[PDB]
C-alpha cells in the first residue's frame, strides 16, 4: 500500500517514468476543505496524487481541476487511463449524482466530467465511506489487514466463522465501517455467503435520530441548542465533542475547539478526557443499534481521527467503558451485541484513495 503526494508538476514528471508506463486508474478523494487526486497502479498498490484546495467550497470546482490535469498531462499518459473513480463527502445516487453536501455547495455530476479521466462504462462517483469500505477490502486483498487494523475486543461469532486470529483478515461476514471524523461516516461491507463475495453498501447512520438510554436530559439539553432532535452525528463529530466539553466544564472554563479538546485529553486533562468518553459513548450507541439492525461479524473504526486518538483506545479503562456501552442494548440478553468483533485503524492510510482504485477494478 503506497501513496505519494506530489505537486502537480512532480506528478507530471513521475507519470513519464518507466514504472508508470502501464494502464492507469484516475482517482480522487474529495473532502470539504481539500481533494487529493492522482493516478493509481498495481500485490502492492501504488498511488501518486496531488492536493487541491476546495477554496470556492463548491463541488463543481472539481471540473476545473480535471481540465487542468488533462491540459497539463501528456496525451501519452492520459491515454493509459482505464478507469476513473472519485469519492465525495455526501450521499451519491447511481454512482453518478452526489449531493446535497453539508460543507460544499452544488451537485457532483459524473456526466459533466471529462471522459479522458472518466472513461464511459468504467467510471463512478462514490460516497467517501463507500470508497473507504472498498479501501478496507483492498487492505484485506493485499494480505495486510493486521498491519492497519487492531482488535479492540473479539466478538463471540469470530471463532465460529474463522479459524485465523481476529484482525488478521476482514472475515467472511458483514463488516460495518464507521468513520467518526468531520462527519460521522458509515458503510456496510455486506457478505453474500452464496457466492462468497463482499459488496459495499453506502449508509447514512450518522443522520438517524438518537434513541435514548438513561440520557433523556442530556439529549434534551442538546435538542434545545440545535432546535432539532439530535442525531448521532450531533453527538459524534467536532461540534459534538465541543458540546460534551461545554457540558463537562459548565462555564468554569471557556470553550475550546474539538482539536484542542483532543490535545488536552492526550495530556491527561480530566475535563477533556471526560468529553472524549462522552463522544465515544454515543459512537458505541451507533454501534450497538447497528449491531442489531445489520448483524455484522465485525465493526471497524477508521480515519485519521481514530489513528491519531490511539492514546485514548490504548487506555484499558477507556476501552472497557466503550465495550460496556457497546453491550448496552436490550437485545444483548440474546447476545446480539456480544457477537461482534470491534477493530480500529491503528496505522495511517488513506482508505478512500485505495478504495476508488479497488472499485475501478470491478468496473474494468
Q: State the residues that interact with ligand 4V5 by CB under 6 A.
A: 89-91, 100-102, 127-129, 179, 182-185, 204, 206-207, 233, 334
Is residue 289 near its own copies by the rule CB under 8 A? yes
Based on CB atoms, which residue is closest to its own copies, 155 or 309? 155
Parallel/antiparallel/unpaired status of strands 34-41 and 24-30: antiparallel
Instruction: From the list its own copies, ligand 4V5, none, pick the one residue 86 interacts with, judged by a Cβ distance below 5 to 8 Å according to partner type.
Output: none
Parallel/antiparallel/unpaired status of strands 341-345 and 298-301: parallel
Which residue's C-alpha cell is 477533556? 272
Annotated binding site: 182, 305, 309
Binds its own copies by CB under 8 A, chosen from 24, 117, 124, 139: 124
Q: 175: which 3 cell numbers?
A: 463488516
Based on CB atoms, which residue is closest to ligand 4V5, 100 or 193? 100
Q: 38: which 3 cell numbers?
A: 492522482
**Residues 199-238: x/- map of binding to its own copies (CB under 8 A)?**
x-xxxxx-xxxxxxx--x-----------xx-x-------
Rg of the chain on CA atoms, in Å:
21
Shortest distance in whole angstroms from residue 150 CB to its own copies:
25
What residues does 49 pair with on adjacent strands?
5, 38
State residue 59 phi and psi, 5-degree precision.
-65, -20
Instruction: From the list its own copies, ligand 4V5, none, pick the one residue 185 interacts with, judged by a Cβ distance below 5 to 8 Å according to partner type.
Output: ligand 4V5
Based on CB atoms, which residue is closest to its own copies, 232 or 313? 232
Shortest distance in whole angstroms from residue 187 CB to its own copies:
11
Instruction: From the list its own copies, ligand 4V5, none, pick the one residue 329 interacts with, judged by a Cβ distance below 5 to 8 Å according to partner type.
Output: its own copies
Is residue 25 near its own copies by the rule CB under 8 A? no
The DSSP call for residue 19 is: G
Distance of alpha carbon 192 from alpha carbon 240, whole angstroms: 35
Based on CB atoms, which residue is closest to its own copies, 84 or 261? 84
Strands across the sheet containing 123-127: 2-5, 46-53, 34-41, 24-30, 81-88, 123-127
Cα dihedral 319→339→326→219 (10° resolution): 160
Shortest distance in whole angstroms from residue 293 CB to ligand 4V5:
11
Distances (CA, A) of 102 to 73, 84, 247, 280: 32, 24, 25, 22
Instruction: From the list ligand 4V5, its own copies, none, pick the one residue 193 interacts with, judged by a Cβ distance below 5 to 8 Å according to partner type.
Output: its own copies
Q: 5: which 3 cell numbers?
A: 503526494
What residues does 162 pair with on adjacent strands?
none
Q: Three-state DSSP class for 275?
A: helix
Distance of alpha carbon 104 from alpha carbon 99, whole angstroms: 9
Is residue 331 near its own copies by the rule CB under 8 A? yes
Instruction: From the list its own copies, ligand 4V5, none, pick the one residue 195 interacts with, judged by a Cβ distance below 5 to 8 Å according to partner type.
Output: its own copies
Distance spanning both ends of the chain, measured CA to CA: 20
Shortest distance in whole angstroms from residue 195 CB to its own copies:
7
Q: 215: which 3 cell numbers?
A: 440520557
Annotated binding site for ADP: 182, 305, 309
Is residue 100 near its own copies by the rule CB under 8 A? yes
Based on CB atoms, which residue is closest to its own copies, 19 or 228? 228
Distance of alpha carbon 264 from alpha carbon 287, whole angstroms: 26
Instruction: From the list its own copies, ligand 4V5, none, pick the one residue 90 interacts with, judged by a Cβ distance below 5 to 8 Å according to partner type.
Output: ligand 4V5
For its own copies, the binding residues (CB under 8 A) are 91, 93-96, 100, 124, 157, 161, 172-173, 188, 190, 192-195, 199, 201-205, 207-213, 216, 228-229, 231, 289, 292-295, 329-331, 334, 336, 359, 362-363
Amino acid at each position: 500500500m503506497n501513496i505519494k503526494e506530489l505537486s502537480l508538476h512532480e506528478l507530471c514528471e513521475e507519470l513519464k517514468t518507466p514504472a508508470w508506463n502501464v494502464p492507469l486508474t484516475f482517482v480522487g478523494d474529495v473532502g470539504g476543505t481539500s481533494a487529493r487526486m492522482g493516478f493509481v497502479r498495481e500485490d502492492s498498490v501504488h498511488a501518486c496524487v496531488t492536493r487541491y484546495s476546495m477554496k470556492r467550497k463548491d463541488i463543481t470546482e472539481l471540473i476545473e481541476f480535471f481540465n487542468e490535469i488533462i491540459e497539463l498531462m501528456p496525451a501519452s499518459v492520459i491515454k493509459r487511463v482505464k478507469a476513473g473513480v472519485i469519492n465525495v463527502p455526501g450521499p451519491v445516487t447511481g454512482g453518478a449524482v452526489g449531493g446535497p453536501f453539508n460543507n460544499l455547495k452544488g451537485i457532483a455530476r459524473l456526466s459533466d466530467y471529462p471522459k479522458a479521466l472518466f472513461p464511459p462504462g468504467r467510471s463512478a462517483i462514490l460516497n467517501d465511506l463507500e470508497a473507504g469500505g472498498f479501501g478496507v477490502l483492498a487492505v484485506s486483498d493485499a494480505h495486510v489487514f493486521s498491519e492497519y487494523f487492531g482488535v479492540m475486543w473479539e466478538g463471540t461469532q469470530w471463532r465460529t466463522c474463522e479459524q485465523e486470529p481476529a484482525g488478521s483478515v476482514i472475515g467472511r461476514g458483514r463488516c460495518l465501517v464507521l468513520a467518526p471524523g468531520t462527519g460521522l461516516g458509515s458503510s456496510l461491507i455486506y457478505y453474500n455467503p452464496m457466492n462468497q463475495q463482499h459488496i459495499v453498501v453506502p449508509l447514512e447512520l450518522g443522520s438517524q435520530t438518537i434513541p435514548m438510554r438513561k440520557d433523556i436530559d442530556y439529549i434534551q439539553t442538546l435538542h434545545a441548542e440545535l432546535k432539532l432532535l439530535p442525531n448521532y452525528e450531533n453527538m459524534v463529530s467536532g461540534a459534538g465533542l465541543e458540546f460534551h466539553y461545554r457540558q463537562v466544564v459548565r462555564g468554569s472554563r471557556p470553550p475550546c475547539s474539538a482539536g484542542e479538546i483532543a490535545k488536552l485529553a492526550s495530556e491527561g486533562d480530566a475535563n477533556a478526557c471526560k468529553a472524549m468518553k462522552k463522544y465515544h459513548e454515543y459512537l458505541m450507541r451507533v454501534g450497538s443499534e447497528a449491531s442489531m439492525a445489520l448483524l455484522p461479524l465485525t465493526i471497524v473504526l477508521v480515519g485519521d481521527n481514530i489513528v491519531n486518538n490511539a492514546f485514548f483506545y490504548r487506555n484499558p479503562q477507556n476501552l472497557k467503558e466503550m465495550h460496556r456501552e457497546a453491550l448496552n442494548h436490550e437485545m444483548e440478553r440474546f447476545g446480539f451485541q456480544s457477537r461482534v468483533t470491534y477493530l480500529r485503524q491503528k496505522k495511517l492510510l488513506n482508505l478512500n484513495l485505495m478504495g476508488c482504485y479497488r472499485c475501478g477494478l470491478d468496473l474494468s
